[PDB]
Design a protein around this ligand. Structure first.
Ligand SMILES: Nc1ncnc2c1ncn2[C@@H]1O[C@H](COS(=O)(=O)NC(=O)[C@@H]2CCCN2)[C@@H](O)[C@H]1O
Ligand SMILES: Nc1ncnc2c1ncn2[C@@H]1O[C@H](COS(=O)(=O)NC(=O)[C@@H]2CCCN2)[C@@H](O)[C@H]1O
Ligand SMILES: [Zn+2]
Ligand SMILES: [Zn+2]
Lengths: 473, 473
RNA sequence: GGAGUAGCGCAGCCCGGUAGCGCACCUCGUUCGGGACGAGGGGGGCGCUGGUUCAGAUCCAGUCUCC
């Protein structure tokens, strides 16, 4: 057996590793997946980190309805125009046909708007810092596990502010949280930037995003944060009486990160041997594979369990593979496939000298005393993270490139990122895409100030800096 | 304040307190609610407790699809017959009409069955211990916030076993977890028992349950655990080859507890002054109300902020009410309404004095040295729990009655529980319900062994013990 | 033009006989330091609908699907 190497067919590698590592499986209904324990464990860790971050910045969780009245989706022009196509609709319910058909939420701005309309009255009711962990449906054509599924789990944040300034700071504060999650926890390097009009969220004034580069050279948006201005406030009549006794509109923001983030993790660190899970988000950090023969079994398994206690004490996430129906050889492969950062080999020769072998998913084995191991793993885990990150950063720089000639652009968007100048015209954008399939990823905040001429039509450059292009997922 | 007393109109008291305490609000769509932060905070605490308990008993979370193919619901006769009426159906999706209409999950046995069908192959593949935190829809007529909503959050556990024995032990293991949650965490006394055929879960062999008595004398089922036998295993072809070369059907179980549990909390401890939340589930256990005047606003708030830290240090869920725009007496009523177990009053004089006033939502009021507070609180939070539970016990004992005549029975089901004998015949049960509206709550596990004659038709008693009847929610 | 046959990957169809092989899975034993070995087993009725025939994955007709 094996696993299709990434160089042969990335897409297949992806689908297979997801299946073999038991992250998910295809669900009966079109475009859906079933998240099995190991995969969902990853999602829970992402929830915990984000939830903590969201709570430290004063947000509170709440839960709004799954069904949204079709009329609501219409109160906002741009919004309904961008989602109308991918909606799932409930028409029949309880035996009878519904008065007004209900839409399965694709996003919750509208329903929350409606409620905000009745909750916000004075300036004492602001800011409104809400978050919701849940599922959403979007009947999209062409789907991929995690990256794009009919139904998907995510977190959708919604805030309402008295001033445009406070709302914009919120929009950034969250995109920074998402970026912190990607860098400090997933070891995924990202580019914090701004989407161009053509690519922004339907109903938003502007959209900020984090863009990651997958090992196959394709870009992937892993999280978005939108400044909605007064679009929904106006659509749903969300006003309040400020301290100057003046009745004005609130400024709302929206932000979300779906389980697509799991896909980003897979396609950023995964290799031909399978998954490589970042330590800080991995369900199992250390897997202990006991090694023995009939006569060694008893004492070896006893040592292993002792080591399992010493490791749990250090607060590490450890798993002991007691399965007797498989050989060490076999187990080694399974756990490498599953992407566990460290495996500890405990054999009788090892137990003999009070030591053990520590194998790292990144490569290499080493012997250490059993007593040391507990206090040493945490630090090694951090180095593991540091390594994964510098490797990904390296991979990114090796695939980022400034282009001045359109012929150089075509070459660069085959390898990865293409830093080009653009006129800032939706018409040109569409053209470049129809021709190269590459799209606008974002206008990076930290990008160097530059002026030039559109890489394709020649007209004076826009944005005051090169834009990031790439073939994306 | 306009808080309808429970003695005047319980239902109104309920709806109002939910609204005024900001636990929830009505959603735009029929029969739905919007869980606001404070209410959802309660739900999160319930999740944390149950999840820890599920995890300690080897279960793992996963996530199955929201949409279920209509055909699946049909593979199990009884199941589709009991849910068919209350289904919401997606027919239109993505612009076109679906080949097969999709049902919004009312429960997940079927979809999981389908998946189990393809995952389970050998006994080494069992038991399957799965849990899923999510939402489900059930278009039911007559709804009440939390107790019965169109859409609702819950936890639904699904297990598959090799033997009937293991599956039945699982059924009880979970019902015990639910009961532990109700008693040790919600301070709600419950009766662990078995539903009669008429009242069991559609598709289950038998149904176990926890029944609580609300302050209005009505019974409420707060959690259920079902032994599904091979009903779904047979419907979805879920077999495996055992240690005896024999191929057989797995025995599955199902269990779930919805946010209805929040309603049980409200209607069990709530009073005319509002909510009374059990300490171990209360989002705020202590509220520090600083009292002052400009010339003292400095030291009081200083002391208050100090106490806030001291209490968080103890791991207590505290909240400081700074709000300079409200009188202390206003704040007192606000937090008595929201059910905070304790209130710490810090005034001007209390600085030089070194003491403070600790007031409990249960009538306690004492003066303690600010230094003693942090250490004393945890212990008081416990006595609080014990008291809450003690009262609910007394209430229950006072509204339970052994009846031997049908007349006495009609009397007893107006006050609460009626411990009567029954023939065990569905026809008779339906009769009693049509005449008194009371139903069968459960055949208690611990009930004393008794033989008699049906309270209504006179025929020999079934179950070998008295059945629990009551008007339920 | 090829192809739909066990969870996966395939052979069998010409020259009909009541379905087979690899991997997986069950049993037993031997194994166990980089995906073990042997023997014994369990599971499908061949995309679907006709027809010919004692008998149809196999022959005939037609319909659905993927490349
Ligand atoms: N079908 C899908 N499968 C998986 N992930 C998906 C899917 N659709 C959107 N996403 C991802 O979810 C995140 C949010 O999107 O669109 O951009 N955005 C919004 O929907 C705003 C912000 C949150 C509330 N509403 C994004 O980061 C986006 O990648
Ligand atoms: N509309 C509703 N609103 C609120 N709560 C509701 C609703 N419907 C059911 N419940 C409550 O949820 C719990 C599970 O309900 S049950 O008894 O039908 N059982 C089931 O649905 C099985 C067992 C768990 C997974 N599927 C029960 O304890 C039941 O009270
Ligand atoms: Zn241009
Ligand atoms: Zn009777």
């Amino acid at each position: 057996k094996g696993l299709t190497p990434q160089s042969q067919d990335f897409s297949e590698w992806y689908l297979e590793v997801i299946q073999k590592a038991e992250l998910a499986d295809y669900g009966p209904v079109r475009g859906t997946i079933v998240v099995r324990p190991y995969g969902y464990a990853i999602w829970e860790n992402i929830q915990q980190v984000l939830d903590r971050m969201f709570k430290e910045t004063g947000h509170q969780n709440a839960y709004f309805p799954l069904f949204i009245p079709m009329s609501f989706l219409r109160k906002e022009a741009e919004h309904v125009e961008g989602f109308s196509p991918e909606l799932a609709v409930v028409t029949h319910a309880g035996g009878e046909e519904l008065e007004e058909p209900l839409a399965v939420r694709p996003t919750s701005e509208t329903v929350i708007g409606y409620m905000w309309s009745k909750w916000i009255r004075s300036w004492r009711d602001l800011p409104q810092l809400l978050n919701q962990w849940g599922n959403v449906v979007r009947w999209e054509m062409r789907t991929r596990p995690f990256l794009r599924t009919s139904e998907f789990l995510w977190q959708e944040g919604h805030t309402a502010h008295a001033t445009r300034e406070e709302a914009e700071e919120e929009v950034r504060r969250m995109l920074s949280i998402y970026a912190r999650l990607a860098r400090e926890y997933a070891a995924i390097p990202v580019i914090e930037g701004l989407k161009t009009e053509k690519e922004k969220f339907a109903g938003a004034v502007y959209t900020t995003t984090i863009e990651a580069l997958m090992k196959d050279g394709k870009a992937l948006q892993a999280g978005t944060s939108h400044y909605l201005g007064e679009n929904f406030a106006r659509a749903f009549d969300i006003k309040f009486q400020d301290r100057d006794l003046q009745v004005k509109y609130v400024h709302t923001t929206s932000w979300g990160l779906s389980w697509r983030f799991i896909g980003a993790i897979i396609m950023t660190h995964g290799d031909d041997r399978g998954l490589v899970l970042p330590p800080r988000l991995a369900p199992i950090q250390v897997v202990i594979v006991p090694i023995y023969k009939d006569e060694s079994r008893e004492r070896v398994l006893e040592a292993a369990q002792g080591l399992r206690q010493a490791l749990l004490a250090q607060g590490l996430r450890v798993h002991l593979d007691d399965r007797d129906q498989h050989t060490p050889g076999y187990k080694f492969h399974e756990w490498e496939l599953k992407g566990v950062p460290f495996r500890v080999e405990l054999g009788p020769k090892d137990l003999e000298g009070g030591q053990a072998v520590l194998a790292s998913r990144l490569g290499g084995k080493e012997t250490l005393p059993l007593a040391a191991l507990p206090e040493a793993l945490p630090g090694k885990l951090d180095a593991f993270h540091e390594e994964l990150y510098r490797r990904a950063l390296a991979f990114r720089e090796d695939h980022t490139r400034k282009v001045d000639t359109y012929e150089a652009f075509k070459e660069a968007v085959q390898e990865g990122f293409a830093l080009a100048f653009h006129c800032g015209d939706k018409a040109c954008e569409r053209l470049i895409q129809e021709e190269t399939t590459a799209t606008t990823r974002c206008v990076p905040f930290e990008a160097e100030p530059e002026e030039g001429f559109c890489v394709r039509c020649g007209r004076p450059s826009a944005y005051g800096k090169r834009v990031v292009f790439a073939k994306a997922y």
